[model samples]
Target: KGEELFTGVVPILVELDGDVNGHKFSVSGEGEGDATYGKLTLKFICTTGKLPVPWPTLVTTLVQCFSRYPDHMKRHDFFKSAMPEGYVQERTIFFKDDGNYKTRAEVKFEGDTLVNRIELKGIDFKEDGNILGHKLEYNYISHNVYITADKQKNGIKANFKIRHNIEDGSVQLADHYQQNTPIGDGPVLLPDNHYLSTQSALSKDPNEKRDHMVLLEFVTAAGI
Candidate 1:
């Protein structure tokens, strides 16, 4: 019998303390390391004044402090470059539910964001070639790619193309590309550190934005 470690829902907690563009902002929250496969979640609270705060600045500051700061030089090692193109690696961690088979994703880390783009691909796999006991063939639905950046430090950016494969050959699918608008000159709070949040309103009346505000104040008033 082979010995390995398998786990689920490894929780992550973080505290971000910093200031952005003359405005003070602090973040606290919980995030999932890995829930099940490609699924994860995060919930956080950002505390600041009623004035808008530049979140990208906050994030960039936090990132640099942890990764590029001279203070962290002794404690952490930073990887400034992505893996070489066509680089492949597999997870050694095994999932218990899959029995003796090591259920993992076959990952190919391709491209470099600084140079051009990054292409990442993954497929579920077992040690043996056979899987799911049904489909002997599959077809990819679509592929997408785009390039897009920030800040005094030139922070971070991403572009990608993915081929989504499905068991059905006849099913129709589509491709998508989005140009993310830079959230410039805004200081508000968020539920978490997630980048997928796409909608927010900046109005003069604070009463109009009470949901996230309630959370922000809750954390602030708690003095945590």
Candidate 2:
């Protein structure tokens, strides 16, 4: 059996009424899915009479939407086994934490190019120094992102590039906690994060620049 394409446009409403300031955010988009795959496109619009929202607020809301919008069958498991001959395909891979997981990277292929990108986000709080006469551990949560994109591929040939960035404290924290380090060093973190730290580190210090080439070929199935 092939598949049935059921696609449509719908409204996603987000409203928050707190204190004197009320927030009304709405998102509308198109979605299409089948037994094999699903896709979504969302456009967000917001209006607040007073009180500006924090960055994490919206980011968390988006994550919530991503979690619930699609049905259980509507999972983002594109090309799990093999690449399709479609013009567009997307996949979202998540990194796990405490039985929960957050999206680490999203891959997309359109026409002949594969868009390999890493987008990491975390909302965390820490005890800050000063600002209280009572002397308390005043903590606040902030959402941060370490995002990079590389669109380098053509037809069957492709080149993947890993960005050089190591300042992602989220990854660093995970590294420290997993390794039993008290108050982890935000900069000099773990081995996995170290790969993204520098080209030399990822390539294990190759003689030349880190150039990844991929070959995609088609295969024929048999047994009649």
Candidate 3:
């Protein structure tokens, strides 16, 4: 997520390695052993590029989310001064003769929603892809949000929003497809020190551009 000469908001992380179809896959910032506003929590452990998962697999389990200071939904409390307005729509995927993979929208206040899963362990070449469901729908009237994918082999097609005011709230992600174009920016996947990435050096160049994305704004640290 670097926005400089590239102009504000650009995050493209598809370096799971070895080519896993094409589209877009994500796992964003902070959450490995931190606390409060500083944020921390997003471990996808390589969904492709064939690392067979292990970017941080301790049996795969790390759940957290703040902003619960009423001493009720307690577990630490007080967080979400930003990045939680949540938005993303279009939920209708079917595989197994059915489909649908999380994100059905519905985040207004209080924050904290858990229970996430992704399992793809070890694959020995010959290449095979599977991730046939995903949804991010939240139009609870209007704050806008839409994103869905079925029959998918990988991932791509993004959406994000959370613009609050009164104090703090800033997080804007977009990649509906194009704008300052550079979706995979010549094989790029930067989330800052992702297990060192085997030592670095990815991008098999499958004509590059795996649905690159740009335009992101995150000013989160504490909410409400």
Candidate 4:
């Protein structure tokens, strides 16, 4: 028997490769089974623990976009494109969440290496500047990724990087982010975040990094 709790507030249940994270998300059947889209109400549930890594922070953004999902689908398509069946595919894609996040997708290739990336852009709070955006490069081979973000608020520029370590099943958040602001301003180094990794080591210590690991459980539930 599992001892994990199943009661909490989560936006969308993000299930990566067969619910490895175990997030129980439910929805209101506002859309017909065959319908491609419709207004849907979703909720989050998880076991009692240290707040489930990225789930909490992620909800901070998703709760704001819950209502927008119904409207956003009109201009966007996270469904049909991923699930061409007009019905739920053998399964649904669940890297879901957005609020004040401009969603767009594109294909890129440098030399012979082609890359498919998911992009999220939008405004941020008064403390963080004005322009904020996130870009994710997909690693289909391992279903892993390179996550990057531009945190702009109140003219403060803070970049972010994360690597979903599939081999060990961990998400590592970067401590120091590249800082380039004021448009013409040169790179500025932020020196407040401290780390516990050995200083002599080449790369930042993996076990003693920012937030150590964060797990965001995403699940997309459609009526059909």
Candidate 5:
């Protein structure tokens, strides 16, 4: 019985201990039971070089690139590289009145160590070519960027917010949102929401409060 079991249904195990690039690495794989059905265990260990870099460098690089070529093509390319593959751009109606409407574009980032969040505000008006009595005209735009590194272990975070206000409104608004992940390859990382108000409705408009708020977040692995 033992001979038969060791012959036809024999079990084989493989294990290797070696070095690569002056770095030591160990790998092992073992199997139990017979050839027809068996349990297997595989493990690998290796020495990797240094860890991650910082976030300021990345931010500075992106800012410089944007300053250099402030076009749609370059912006889209940069956005894609910094954000996720399935990331989609969405346009939401912030405000609408008569033949004028204000919309906002948002891009979300979700990855292992790199996270990028971006948003843009735009307004469209009917091109009548003639300057009428001006029924309704209010336009504004803004952009914000926030980055965090080693969020899980160290909880270190850094953020930057920027905005552009139109003469139609004097009040300012700011806000931030949070996102969490489930237990798995990527742990649950919460996104922070921050907002500030510069002016009030009375100062800008009693009936028409032309103020907007947008928040964005980005995460990196630099542990910075």
Candidate 6:
């Protein structure tokens, strides 16, 4: 076994345990110090005889149970508001766009379960003019959800692909090139002072929109 320690940092651990039907299960967590301070723990539960259930089904059941106990349709209403439109097509609540191109599509289940899949398309032109024909084409599965322990400040993380075209021999109009577009920032968001395009003109034939694929991962964490 290997052990590592860090000073002036907080540690948290989680554990889970339960019994379903005749199956036994357990989970637990602990902190290195006080619960108010910090702790680290490992959690493991026995799933030996328990039949695996799909996450979507499990989530729906729980939501329905809660709604029944409350004796109100407000819970159902809340569920509807929490998810985007076109959540379900026919019987399955498949994922669909929220009408906002800048945002992503989501799959919402009956139990308030929500899953987001990345929209490979680029940002909406009206909302973000800086981005040209920049679009995304993912090679691997790309899905994400926003999670935060604190309510005030929440963040999101995502992994995806970005693709765009660059004209070869065309003369770069200084004004058009300088216009800051969302795609102009490349993989990272730039500060206000950063120049979007510096080159005044093209030397030879226009550079065809090169197919450059790069793996991208982004994470954001902040206080609410």
Candidate 2's clash total is 0
Taking the tens digit of each residue's C-alpha lDDT, what string does model 2 give over 64-179?
A: 11111123322221122112122221222121221111223222333333222322232222212111111211122222222122222211111122111122322211211111
Point out the higher-scoring one by lDDT: 4 or 5: 5
TM-score of each: 0.26, 0.21, 0.21, 0.20, 0.21, 0.18
The deviation in Å at residue 39 for candidate 4 is 24
Model 1 spans with C-alpha error above 4 angstroms? 1-6, 48-51, 54-224
Compared with the true structure, the alpha-carbon lDDT of candidate 6 equals 0.20
Q: Across residues 1-224, which tens digit of lDDT does each residue of candidate 3 receive?
A: 11111121112221121212332333322222122221222323323233321222111111112211222222212112211332122222212212222223221122232222222222221222122111212111112222222113122232323221111232212111200111122322111111100011112224533322111111121121
- Output candidate 3 Cα RMSD: 18.9
Candidates 1 and 3, the one with greater lDDT: 1
- lDDT of all predictions, in order shown? 0.23, 0.20, 0.21, 0.22, 0.23, 0.20
| lDDT digits (tens) for residues 1-224 of candidate 5 | 11122112222232323222222333222222221211111111111322011111111111101111112222222222322231222222212221211222222323221212323222232233111122222333224333333245422233333222323533222222222222122222232322211111111224422221111211212111
| Window of ten residues with lowest summed lDDT in model 5 | 57-66
For residue 59, what is the lDDT in candidate 1?
18
Per-candidate Cα RMSD to the true structure, in Å, reads: 21.9, 19.6, 18.9, 21.2, 26.2, 21.9
- Candidate 2, which segments miss by more than 4 Å at Cα? 1-9, 18-38, 49-51, 62-224
lDDT of 5 at 92: 29
C-alpha positional error of residue 99 in candidate 4 after TM-score superposition, expressed in Å: 9.4
Backbone N/Cα/C clashes per model: 5, 0, 29, 14, 7, 22
Ten residues in a row with the worst lDDT in model 6? Answer: 60-69
Per-residue lDDT over 9-80 for candidate 1, one digit per residue giving the tens place of the 0 to 100 score: 334344544322233445554444321231333344554433233222111111100111122121211111
Please give the distance, in angstroms, between residue 152's alpha carbon in candidate 1 and its true position after superposition: 24
